[PDB]
Amino acid sequence: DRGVQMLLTTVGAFAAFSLMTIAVGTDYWLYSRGVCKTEEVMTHSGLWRTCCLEGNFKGLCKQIDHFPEDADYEADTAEYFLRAVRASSIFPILSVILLFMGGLCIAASEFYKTRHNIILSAGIFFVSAGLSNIIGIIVYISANAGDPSKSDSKKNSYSYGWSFYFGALSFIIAEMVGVLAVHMFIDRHKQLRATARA
Amino acid sequence: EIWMCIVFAYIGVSVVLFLVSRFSPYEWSTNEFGIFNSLWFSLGAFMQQGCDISPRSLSGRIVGGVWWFFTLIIISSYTANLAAFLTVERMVSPIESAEDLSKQTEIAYGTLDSGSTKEFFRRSKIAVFDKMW
Amino acid sequence: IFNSLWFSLGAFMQQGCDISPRSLSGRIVGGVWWFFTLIIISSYTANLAAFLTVERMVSPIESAEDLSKQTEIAYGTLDSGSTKEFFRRSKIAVFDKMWTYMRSAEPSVFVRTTAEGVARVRKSKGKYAYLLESTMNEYIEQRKPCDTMKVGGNLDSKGYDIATPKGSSLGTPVNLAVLKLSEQGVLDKLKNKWWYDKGECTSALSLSNVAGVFYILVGGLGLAMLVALIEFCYKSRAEAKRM
Amino acid sequence: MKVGGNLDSKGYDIATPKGSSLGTPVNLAVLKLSEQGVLDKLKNKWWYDK
Amino acid sequence: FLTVERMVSPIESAEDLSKQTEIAYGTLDSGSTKEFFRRSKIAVFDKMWTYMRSAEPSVFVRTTAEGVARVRKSKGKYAYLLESTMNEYIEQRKPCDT
C-alpha cells in the first residue's frame, strides 16, 4: 500500500538521520587507553575529543589531535591526505547532509504529487548517504590503525562503542529506505503507464 | 573490521545494482535485477559461484566489475593470510611485564607468605606495586 | 565491441559469463585469455602468500647472540673505556666473536664518544647498533625524539658506588644508608623520577591492507550511479522535446 | 619461563666476621673475579651449560 | 605443507648438529675421539662437549660396533661421531642405511 510504504520510508529515514547525527556527535566510538590533555587510562575515543574513563582525571574530554607533529615528520603525501580527510570528518558529515536532503525530498514529495522525480532524488540521496557512511567508516578505521592504542587488538583489546554501532546501524537503515524509495518511484511510474493505457 | 566492511560493501553493492538496474522507466522489466535478485547476484559473485543473470547496462556492468575486482582481491588475501598463518607458528606470551599483570585480572599472581618479596610489595611507593599489592 | 569487453572482464575476474564464444576464432581467443587469467590470478595469490609468510617469519634482534650471528647490522663499542676491555678479555664464546668482528671491520665501528655514536645509530636508519651502559641506554630511550630503543638484557653486571677515601669515619654510615635507601625503595623511586617520570616518550590482515580496494569499489559504485543518472536525464530530455 | 625485567636490584655477598683479616682480601677477590668474567663463566656453567 | 617441506634442511656440518638438540650425538666412551672434545676450545667443539659431559641418558658408547648399531636402531634420532676412514667403510657396507 502507498500509505504504509510512505510511513515506513519516512520513519526509517528519520531513524537513520537521528542515528547518524547521534553517532557524529557522541564520543563513544572506540574504547582505548590514552592520555588526557597530552597519565594513561581507559578512555572512550570519539570523533573530535576523547574523555577519560575510570581515571584520576575522569571526565576530561581532551580533543583528538589528528596531526602528531611532535617529531616534525611528513612521510608520504597519502598519509597527510588521509589525516586531513579524517580530521575534517568530511564523509560522516556528508552522509548526515545527504540523509537530511533525502528526508526533505521525501517530505516535499507529498506536496508535489505530480512530480515523481523527487522520490527518485530522495532514493539517490539515501544511497549516496550510505556510500558516504561506508567511506567514513573505512577512513576512520584506517586512521585509527596509525596509533598503537587504537590498534593491536591482541594486547590493547580496543572495543567499539555504541556510537560507532549507531553509525553502522544508520547505514543499514538508509540503504533499506533507499530500496523502498526506488520501489515507490517504480510503482508511481508503473501506475502512470497503466492509467495511460486505459 | 574487514568482515564488517565486507558485509557493508555487499549490502551497498546490492542496493546500487538494484537501483541502477530498475530505476529508469525507459528500461521497463527487461532485466531481472530485483532487490532479492541483486542480493543473490552479489552473494554469488562474492563466493565465486557464478550467476544465473548478468547485468546488461553500462552502469550495472560497472557495478559488477568493481564488485568482481573487490571479491578477487579479498578472497586472494584471505587465502594468502590463512596460508601464512598455517605455515608460521607464532606463540606469544600473554604477560611480559609487571605492569601488565596489574592491568589484567584473569591471571593470578602471588609471592611468599613470609619473605623479602612480601615486604617489597607491602611497603612500596611505585604506582605499579600498590596496584599489584 | 561492448559485449566483448564485458566477456573479457568477466573472464579475467573468473566470474559467471552470460554468453560464451561459439566460433573457432572466438573460442581460441577465449581459451588463451582463460589460460592467461588462470596463470596471473594464481601468481598473484602465490606472491601475496609469500609476502605474508616472509613477513611473518621476520624476527627482530633481541639478544646479543642474535646480533652476533647476523652481519647485516653493524655494531661497535667506544674507542676506549671498559667496553672494549670487557670484550677483549671476555672468554665467553658469544662475546669474543663480537670483539673479533669490531677489530677487523671497515668502516671503523668504534666512535670517538657517545654523543655522535648515538647519533650514528639515529642516522643509520636501523643499520647500526651501539653497545653502552644500560643506565644511559634507558635515559636516551626516554628523550626526544624517542627513536632509539633498548633490547635484550645486560651482557654483564656492574654497579655504581659511593666513593669514600680509605680510612674515613663516613665509610660505614654511608654504606648502611645506601642499603637502607634500597630496602625502603627510595633509590628505585629516584631512578624512576629521573628516567621515566621526567621522560619525554596483529597477525590478521587489517583494513589498512585492503583499504584501496574498498575505495575503488565505492568510487566505481559512484561512477556507475552517475552514468545511470546521466543516461536517465538524457533520455528524459530527448522524450520531453519529442513530446 | 621468565618474562620481563627485574623488579628491583639485589645482590649476593660473601659474609665475613666484623673486623676480620679476611674482610679486605675477599672484597678484592670478588671484584677481580668479576673483571675477568670468572663469575659470568661460573654462572653460565651451572645455569645454562648444565 | 609444501613451504615447510621446502624449508626442511638436514644437518650437514658439525655446527648444524651443535645448534639443534633433537638428534642426539655421542662418541666412544674412551679414546682419542673423547679426548679431542675435552681439550678443545673452539666455539663449535666445546659447545657440544658441555652437552656430551652432562647428558641423560649418556650419549657415550663403549664400543664402535654398538655405536653404529644404536644409530641404525634410533631411526635417525641418534648420530655417531667417529673416524672418517671407518665411517666411509661402513657407509659402503650392507644394508647401506648409514
Residue numbers in the entry:
A (entry chain F): 5 to 42, 55 to 214
B (entry chain B): 524 to 551, 567 to 671
C (entry chain C): 573 to 773, 784 to 825
D (entry chain B): 721 to 770
E (entry chain A): 623 to 720
Could you share sentences copied from the article?
They are composed of four subunits (GluA1–GluA4); the GluA2 subunit dominates AMPAR function throughout the forebrain.
We next determined cryo-EM structures of the GluA2–TARPγ2 receptor under two different pH conditions in an apo state (in the absence of l-glutamate). We chose pH 8.0 to ensure strict alkaline conditions for our structural studies and note that the GluA2–TARPγ2 kinetics at pH 8.0 matched that at pH 7.4, used in the functional studies above. As already apparent in the two-dimensional (2D) class averages, the signal encompassing the NTD tier was diffuse at low pH but was well defined throughout the receptor at pH 8.0. This difference was clearly reflected in the three-dimensional (3D) maps; the NTD tier was compact at pH 8.0 with the two dimers associated through the BD interface (comparable to previous structures), while the BD interface was absent at pH 5.5 in most classes, resulting in highly heterogeneous NTD dimer conformations (for example). Atomic models derived from the consensus refinements reveal differences in the LBD tier between the average LBD structures at pH 5.5 and pH 8.0, with larger displacements of the BD LBDs versus the AC LBDs in the pH 5.5 receptor. These lead to an approximation of the LBD upper (D1) lobes between the BD subunits at pH 5.5 and to rearrangements of their G helices (inset), which mark LBD conformations in different states of the gating cycle.
